[PDB]
């Protein structure tokens, strides 16, 4: 089976920041740079 | 949204007539939210410059970029002249609409913090 | 940025508003041009979004 | 892949001329805020209305002064004049000057203003000021057509030397609130439901305001036609 | 003091890129017009994508082909980047055929030409074929809108065919600039510039036009009010 990332799957970085994907927004709902480039992932600063 | 601005530009200057305060603010000598003294009372330029007849007008002014939510200002709410931010008025209205009682909601909140 | 300046585009209104907000936050030095301030923010790793 | 759209149904719920609720469902994913945001922006800024732009009061130099014989200060009176809802019946009319002369132990209302051709006061029971014995109030107020919100020191208009510029609230719309909730049609999961809430002063109805709001937007879309 | 119809400027580079200016516009209308268009341009603009792949002697996606460097998964990944333009509006589907062999690097150019169908990126790499390496493919490309994963559409032309994730949107990127402008004695007005990048399937101007059409049609939905029976 080929498994695409879905809501409830678990992500982490090398620094101990871990979390479960709670939402997947369409590209037009994503925060973007002035040149139109949208961000991939939004991490809450409260976790730092 | 409920925090207020504290600015160092004015730095507690003394003014006689409020129009001198407005003029000084226009020259860039005194910041909007910087504490100053007009006459004997301590106040800020913002409380003078912008005086709203009701919350709706204040938030409408916020929508047009006239003032931010953290700017200390003057608003007429429930027959009272209040020196406060549009943000705290907004909070008050959030509570009031949530509980559907305006008087009680006014009594429950601490507005000045 | 320089790419943008070459493409014929100036600083955005919203970018200016954000620069005002950032100016109040002590992130940039008041009096500098929009580009200089955007560079200061970018050097802090922050961008307009 | 293969898609079939039923198309949306518009639902209206109104209380008087002051308030209304607008529900548009179902909508394709994302179109909830795509429609709702411009409409809100337009409804606040671009809707034509009237406002008091200037006030002159006899023997009153500036805004922070006080009025002998009257209990309210100038500041409070100006506020009361901001809440005046004035409607222009004739589309031609740009501006009106309303005069008010009263004295003695009386409470001045919006009814007291001398009637002008094709000018209707929606709120005649609005309180302006209270006068005591010997109290005298002579005032002229400037009422203009316009849109949005203009501070007093922006338009900066004076008919005479003692005329006080007033922050001009043109917008008949007091507030706009919209909320997009997820909804489902059959097995379609992510479809949008747009709920719109519009508060006006009664000079324009919420439904009229919205209809005017969409028309402005539609008209702007036609600007992409001829290069 | 009412603003009137603004000048609309158009700048194009090939079929890939475009800039669309509107000036002057009333304050705050740069965003009001610009943003919904970007939201519609990134989502609702119809286009073409490969919906299916069949390779001879390949039963599924998880298999490798003798003489070929890339596994089927990578091959399909490459085929997801294939940009196919339909000249005829009436045509909803096309099956491209690819027959290749011997040592060579098979690109998207190697597909057999079909009437009223143009490949916008003929240099796109598909596979690396070795001596005796042999590749026979049939790829189904459809018209569609948005993003439909393979699991949702499940399109199979034949038994051993593999459903492909389809990104239908022709629009690669959308940005908009709002700059300070003035007309006469008016100040703080808006100059709106829409920057549009597409894949060539449809031109940025076409995209802008059908986006505007979509928004207008949506505005039509307010034409028929209904009383609320909740009371
Ligand atoms: Mg003022
Ligand atoms: Mg209290």
Curated annotation (Swiss-Prot), chain A:
Membrane-spanning residues: none
Recorded superkingdom: Bacteria
Record text on subunit structure and interactions: The RNAP catalytic core consists of 2 alpha, 1 beta, 1 beta' and 1 omega subunit. When a sigma factor is associated with the core the holoenzyme is formed, which can initiate transcription.
Protein role: DNA-dependent RNA polymerase catalyzes the transcription of DNA into RNA using the four ribonucleoside triphosphates as substrates.
Family statement drawn from the similarity comment of this UniProt entry: Belongs to the RNA polymerase beta chain family.
The protein's name: DNA-directed RNA polymerase subunit beta
Naturally occurring in which organism (per UniProt): Thermus thermophilus (strain ATCC 27634 / DSM 579 / HB8)
Gene: rpoB
UniProtKB/Swiss-Prot annotation, chain B:
Domain of life: Bacteria
Family per similarity comment: Belongs to the RNA polymerase beta' chain family.
Assembly, per entry: The RNAP catalytic core consists of 2 alpha, 1 beta, 1 beta' and 1 omega subunit. When a sigma factor is associated with the core the holoenzyme is formed, which can initiate transcription.
Described function: DNA-dependent RNA polymerase catalyzes the transcription of DNA into RNA using the four ribonucleoside triphosphates as substrates.
Protein name: DNA-directed RNA polymerase subunit beta'
Native organism: Thermus thermophilus (strain ATCC 27634 / DSM 579 / HB8)
Full-length numbering of the shown residues: 792 to 904 of 1524
Swiss-Prot record, chain D:
Keywords: DNA-directed RNA polymerase, Nucleotidyltransferase, Transcription, Transferase
Catalysed reaction, written as an equation: RNA(n) + a ribonucleoside 5'-triphosphate = RNA(n+1) + diphosphate
Keyword Plastid tagged: no
Enzyme Commission identifier(s): 2.7.7.6
Superkingdom of source: Bacteria
Gene Ontology molecular function, alphabetical: DNA binding; DNA-directed RNA polymerase activity; protein dimerization activity
Region (Alpha N-terminal domain (alpha-NTD)): 1-227
Top class in the EC scheme: transferase
Example of a GO cellular component annotation carried by this entry: cytoplasm
Gene Ontology biological process: DNA-templated transcription
Homology family: Belongs to the RNA polymerase alpha chain family.
Written domain comment of the UniProt record: The N-terminal domain is essential for RNAP assembly and basal transcription, whereas the C-terminal domain is involved in interaction with transcriptional regulators and with upstream promoter elements.
Subunit text: Homodimer. The RNAP catalytic core consists of 2 alpha, 1 beta, 1 beta' and 1 omega subunit. When a sigma factor is associated with the core the holoenzyme is formed, which can initiate transcription.
Function: DNA-dependent RNA polymerase catalyzes the transcription of DNA into RNA using the four ribonucleoside triphosphates as substrates.
Protein name: DNA-directed RNA polymerase subunit alpha
Organism: Thermus thermophilus (strain ATCC 27634 / DSM 579 / HB8)
